[PDB]
Amino acid sequence: RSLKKGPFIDLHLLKKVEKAVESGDKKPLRTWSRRSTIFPNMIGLTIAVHNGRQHVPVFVTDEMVGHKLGEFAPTRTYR
Amino acid sequence: PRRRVIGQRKILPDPKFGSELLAKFVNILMVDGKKSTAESIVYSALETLAQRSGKSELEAFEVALENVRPTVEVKSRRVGGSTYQVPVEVRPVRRNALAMRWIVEAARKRGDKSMALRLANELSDAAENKGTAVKKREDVHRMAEANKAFA
Amino acid sequence: ARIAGINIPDHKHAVIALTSIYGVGKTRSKAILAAAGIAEDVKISELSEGQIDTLRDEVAKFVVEGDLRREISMSIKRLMDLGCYRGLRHRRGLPVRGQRTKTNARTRKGPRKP
Amino acid sequence: AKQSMKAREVKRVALADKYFAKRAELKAIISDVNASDEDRWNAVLKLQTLPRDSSPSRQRNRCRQTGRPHGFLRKFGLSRIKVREAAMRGEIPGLKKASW
Amino acid sequence: NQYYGTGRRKSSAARVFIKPGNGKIVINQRSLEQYFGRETARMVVRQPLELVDMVEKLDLYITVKGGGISGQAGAIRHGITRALMEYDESLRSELRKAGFVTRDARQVERKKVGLRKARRRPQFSKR
Amino acid sequence: QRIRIRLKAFDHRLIDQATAEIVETAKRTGAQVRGPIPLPTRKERFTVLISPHVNKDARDQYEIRTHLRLVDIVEPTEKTVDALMRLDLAAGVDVQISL
RNA sequence: GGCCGGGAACUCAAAGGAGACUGCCAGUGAUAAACUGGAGGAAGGUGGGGAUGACGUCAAGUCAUCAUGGCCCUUACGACCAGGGCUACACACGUGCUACAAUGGCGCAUACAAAGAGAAGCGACCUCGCGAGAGCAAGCGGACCUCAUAAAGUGCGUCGUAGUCCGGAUUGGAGUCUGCAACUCGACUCCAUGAAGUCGGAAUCGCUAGUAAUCGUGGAUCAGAAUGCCACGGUGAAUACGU
Numbered sequence: 001r002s003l004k005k006g007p008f009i010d011l012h013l014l015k016k017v018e019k020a021v022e023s024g025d026k027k028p029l030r031t032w033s034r035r036s037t038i039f040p041n042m043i044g045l046t047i048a049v050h051n052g053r054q055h056v057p058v059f060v061t062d063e064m065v066g067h068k069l070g071e072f073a074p075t076r077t078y079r
Numbered sequence: 080p081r082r083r084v085i086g087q088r089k090i091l092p093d094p095k096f097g098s099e100l101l102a103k104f105v106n107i108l109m110v111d112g113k114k115s116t117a118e119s120i121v122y123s124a125l126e127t128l129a130q131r132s133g134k135s136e137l138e139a140f141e142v143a144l145e146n147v148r149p150t151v152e153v154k155s156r157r158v159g160g161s162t163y164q165v166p167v168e169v170r171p172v173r174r175n176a177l178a179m180r181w182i183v184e185a186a187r188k189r190g191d192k193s194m195a196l197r198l199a200n201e202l203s204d205a206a207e208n209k210g211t212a213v214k215k216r217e218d219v220h221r222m223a224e225a226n227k228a229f230a
Numbered sequence: 231a232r233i234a235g236i237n238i239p240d241h242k243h244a245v246i247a248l249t250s251i252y253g254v255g256k257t258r259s260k261a262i263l264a265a266a267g268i269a270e271d272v273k274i275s276e277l278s279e280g281q282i283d284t285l286r287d288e289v290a291k292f293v294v295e296g297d298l299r300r301e302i303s304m305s306i307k308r309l310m311d312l313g314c315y316r317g318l319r320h321r322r323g324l325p326v327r328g329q330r331t332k333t334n335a336r337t338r339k340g341p342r343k344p
Numbered sequence: 345a346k347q348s349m350k351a352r353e354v355k356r357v358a359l360a361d362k363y364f365a366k367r368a369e370l371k372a373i374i375s376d377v378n379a380s381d382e383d384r385w386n387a388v389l390k391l392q393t394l395p396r397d398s399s400p401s402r403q404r405n406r407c408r409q410t411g412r413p414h415g416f417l418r419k420f421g422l423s424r425i426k427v428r429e430a431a432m433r434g435e436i437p438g439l440k441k442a443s444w
Numbered sequence: 445n446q447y448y449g450t451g452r453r454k455s456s457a458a459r460v461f462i463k464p465g466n467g468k469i470v471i472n473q474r475s476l477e478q479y480f481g482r483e484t485a486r487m488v489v490r491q492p493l494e495l496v497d498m499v500e501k502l503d504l505y506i507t508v509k510g511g512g513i514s515g516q517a518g519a520i521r522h523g524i525t526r527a528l529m530e531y532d533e534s535l536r537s538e539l540r541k542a543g544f545v546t547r548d549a550r551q552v553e554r555k556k557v558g559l560r561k562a563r564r565r566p567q568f569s570k571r
Numbered sequence: 572q573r574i575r576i577r578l579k580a581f582d583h584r585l586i587d588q589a590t591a592e593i594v595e596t597a598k599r600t601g602a603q604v605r606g607p608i609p610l611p612t613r614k615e616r617f618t619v620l621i622s623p624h625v626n627k628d629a630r631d632q633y634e635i636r637t638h639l640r641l642v643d644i645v646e647p648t649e650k651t652v653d654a655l656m657r658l659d660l661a662a663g664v665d666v667q668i669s670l
Numbered sequence: 671g672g673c674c675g676g677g678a679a680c681u682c683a684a685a686g687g688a689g690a691c692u693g694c695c696a697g698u699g700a701u702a703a704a705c706u707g708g709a710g711g712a713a714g715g716u717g718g719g720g721a722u723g724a725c726g727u728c729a730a731g732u733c734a735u736c737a738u739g740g741c742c743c744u745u746a747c748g749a750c751c752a753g754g755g756c757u758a759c760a761c762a763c764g765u766g767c768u769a770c771a772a773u774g775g776c777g778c779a780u781a782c783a784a785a786g787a788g789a790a791g792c793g794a795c796c797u798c799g800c801g802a803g804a805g806c807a808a809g810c811g812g813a814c815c816u817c818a819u820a821a822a823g824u825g826c827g828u829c830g831u832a833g834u835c836c837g838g839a840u841u842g843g844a845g846u847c848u849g850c851a852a853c854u855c856g857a858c859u860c861c862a863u864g865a866a867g868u869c870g871g872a873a874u875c876g877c878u879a880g881u882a883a884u885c886g887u888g889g890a891u892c893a894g895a896a897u898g899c900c901a902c903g904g905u906g907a908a909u910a911c912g913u
Contacts, residue, residue, distance in 0.1 A: 563881060
C-alpha cells in the first residue's frame with residue numbers, strides 16, 4: 001500500500017494470467033486470491049473469484065483497474 | 080445525621096477587602112473549581128456598581144441583601160396521609176445563604192452581554208426593590224401568611 | 231460583492247467572508263488573501279474594484295461550485311454503475327466506511343421507522 | 345487446551361527460528377531506497393514463497409502449564425490462575441500481597 | 445546571622461533563610477510579584493509578618509519545589525513561622541493561636557478497584 | 572584507580588549483611604572505602620482476577636521490591652583486588668564489579 | 671551554568687530509633703464503667719486510607735483454565751489445508767464519550783507536578799517533508815541516557831447572541847506505517863463537504879472533605895489496533911435544623 005513498495009499480486013495468478021494472454025483464448029480462470037490488484041494486462045478475461053461457497057465470474061473491463069478482486073464478489077446474503 | 084455533631088469549617092477572608100461574607104459569595108458563584116474567574120467577575124461587578132450609587136462596595140452589597148433576606152418559610156408535613164404546609168422561622172445563617180443563592184440564580188437568567196454586567200444590573204435592581212429575587216421573597220412570605228392556621 | 235456567481239457578505243472580515251464559496255475553506259482563504267496582498271481582518275465593504283478583481287483572479291485558479299458538484303456526482307455515479315461493494319452501499323443507503331449497523335447509523339438511515 | 349494446539353505452537357517457533365536471516369535480508373532489500381527497481385519486484389515476489397508459519401506474528405503466547413490463550417503475564421510465563429496458586433504456595437521469590 | 449525553617453504541604457518543600465533589616469523577599473531568584481501572580485498567594489505568604497509587626501525589618505531568602513501554586517504558598521508560610529520561632533522563641537503563643545504552627549496533613553486519596561475514583565461508584569439499575 | 576560495587580536483592584537484611592562483609596574485608600586489607608550509599612528502591616505491581624469465570628470485581632494485588640546499594644573503593648592494591656575476587660556471598664544477592 | 675576548586679550545613683534518598691496511652695486538670699455519675707470541656711503538642715480520644723469476610727443461606731456460578739465418577743464417537747463427534755463468518759440490520763434495553771456556547775471559540779507568549787517503562791527495547795542532536803513520517807546516527811540494563819513539551823492558569827488582541835468564527839456525524843480526492851497479506855474488516859495525516867442538537871415526558875443514579883465537579887500524565891495485554899480496565903498529581907466547593 002505504501003507507494004515505495006508498489007502494488008501486490010499473487011505469483012500463481014500472475015503466471016496463469018501470462019499464459020492465458022500469450023496463448024490467446026481462455027475459459028474462466030478460478031482464483032481464491034481476493035487480495036490481488038487488477039493490472040491493465042488482465043482486461044478481456046473471465047476471472048472466477050471465491051466468496052465462501054461458489055466462484056463468481058467477473059468479466060474484467062477497463063474501469064476496474066486498481067481495485068482488489070474481492071470487491072466484485074460480495075460475501076453476505078440479505079433480502 | 081442521626082447521632083452526630085458537626086463543627087464549623089473555617090473560611091479565609093477576601094484578599095482585596097476583608098469580609099467573610101464576600102468570600103462565601105465567591106464560593107457560591109464558582110463552578111468546577113475555578114476561583115480566579117469568580118473573583119474577577121465579582122470584583123468587576125462591584126467596581127461598576129460602586130459608581131452607580133456613590134457609596135462603598137460593601138455598603139451597596141449590604142443594602143442589596145437587606146431587601147432579599149427572608150424571615151419565615153414553609154416546611155412540608157405528612158403524617159395523616161395529607162400534605163400540610165407548616166410555617167417556620169428562618170435563622171440568620173440560612174437567611175444570608177438563601178439571599179445569596181437567589182441573587183446568583185436570578186443573575187444567570189438575564190440576557191445581557193457579560194456575566195459581570197448581569198450581576199451588577201441585578202444588584203442595582205435589588206437595591207431599588209425590583210427583580211426576580213424580590214419577587215421570590217414576596218412569594219415565600221405570601222405562602223407563609225396564607226397558612227398561619229397550621230402554626 | 232459578487233465573486234464566483236454568488237454574493238459574499240459585507241460586514242465580515244475577509245478571511246471569514248471568503249469561506250461562503252462551495253470549495254473554499256480557511257486554509258485556501260488564507261492562501262488566497264496572501265497571494266492578493268490584503269490583511270485578513272479587513273471588511274469587504276472597504277475594498278476597491280481593482281482589489282475585488284484581483285481576488286476574482288485568485289479564486290479563478292481552483293475548482294468551485296458547479297464544476298466541483300459535477301465532479302463529485304460523477305465520482306459517485308461511477309461506483310453506483312460499476313456495482314462493487316461501495317456502490318451497493320451507496321445505492322442501498324447504508325454506511326460505506328465499515329461502521330457498525332446493529333445500532334446507530336442514523337445519519338445514513340434517517341430517524342427511526344417503527 | 346487440546347493436544348494439537350501445543351503442537352502447532354512448537355512447529356511455528358521451529359520454522360521461525362529456521363528462516364530468520366533470509367527474511368531479514370529480503371526485507372532490507374525491499375525497504376532500501378535507491379534500488380534497481382527490479383530487484384525490489386524480485387524480493388517482494390520471493391518473500392511470499394516461504395512458509396507462512398515462519399513469520400513471528402503467527403505465534404500466540406500461552407500458559408506454560410495449561411495452554412490457556414488468555415490472561416497471560418510476561419514476567420512469569422503463566423496465566424492469572426496459576427500465578428495466584430504458586431504465589432500463595434510460596435514459589436515466586438519476592439512476591440507478596442500489597443497495600444498502600 | 446541566619447535563621448532557618450523548613451515547610452511542607454501537599455507535595456511541596458520549602459527552605460526559608462531569614463536575616464535582619466530592610467524588608468525584602470526573594471524566591472527562587474525572583475521577586476514575590478514576579479513569582480506569585482495571585483493576590484491570594486501573596487496574602488498567604490505575607491500573613492505571619494503582618495501578624496507580628498516585622499514587615500520592614502527582615503530580609504527573606506526562600507527556595508521551594510514540588511506541587512502547584514497553593515501548595516507552594518502554604519509551604520512558604522509554614523517555613524516562615526518556623527524560622528521566626530527559631531529567631532525569637534516567644535512568639536510561639538500568638539502564632540499558635542493564629543493557627544500557623546500546625547502541619548496540614550491532607551493528601552490525595554487513592555483510586556480503588558470497582559470504583560471510578562476514590563469514592564465515586566458507577567451507575568446502578570434495578571432491572 | 573577506583574573500584575565500584577553494586578549490590579541488588581529482594582531482602583534488605585540480606586543486602587545489609589553482604590555490604591558489611593565487603594566493607595570489613597576491604598578494611599582489613601589496607602584500603603580506603605566510601606561507605607555504602609542507599610539508592611531508590613524499585614516497586615513492581617501486578618493485579619489479577621481471582622475467579623475462574625465472570626466476576627469482574629474481586630481482584631488481587633501483588634508487589635515485588637528491589638533493594639540496591641553502592642560501595643566505592645578509592646585506592647586499591649593487588650592483594651585487595653584478589654581478596655575481593657576470591658569472596659563468596661549468599662544465594663540471593665547480585666554483585667556487579669566495575670573497574 | 672552547580673559550570674569549576676570545594677562543603678557535609680538544608681532539600682532528598684533508605685536502615686536503627688522516639689512519639690498518643692483517657693497519660694494530666696476540672697465538672698457529672700452507683701464511693702463504678704464511662705461522658706462533656708481544658709492544657710501541652712505535628713497530630714486527641716478508632717488521627718486519615720488499605721489488607722483482614724464467623725456458623726450458615728441461595729441444589730447460586732464455572733465438566734470451555736485445570737483435575738475427576740458415569741455415559742458416548744473411533745477410515746470419525748479425532749488430523750492438515752486455502753477461502754469465508756464471529757463486524758449482518760425493520761426494531762427494544764444497559765453502560766460510556768463529545769456537545770448544544772461568552773465562567774466561551776480562535777491567534778500570539780509565559781509560571782508551576784506526581785507516579786511509571788526500556789535489548790528482536792527506549793531512539794536524542796542534525797538534514798529533508800505543509801503534515802502523518804523518512805535518512806544518518808550518540809547514550810542507556812539506567813537517582814546519570816531516552817520516552818517527555820503537563821493541561822486547566824496568567825498577559826495582550828479579536829469575535830458580539832447568530833444554528834454562529836458554537837458543534838464535528840457523514841461523504842469525495844490524495845497519502846504514511848505495522849505486517850507474507852489491510853476488499854469484506856486496521857490506526858493516523860492533508861485539501862474539500864459541514865448532519866442532528868438552543869439543556870431533554872413519566873421515571874431514575876453518585877456523593878459528607880482534599881470528597882463531589884473539572885484539567886492533564888503513566889502501565890498491563892500487545893507486530894499493529896482504547897471513549898474500556900488498573901494507577902498519579904493540579905485547582906477545589908455547597909449542605910446536615912432533625913428522625
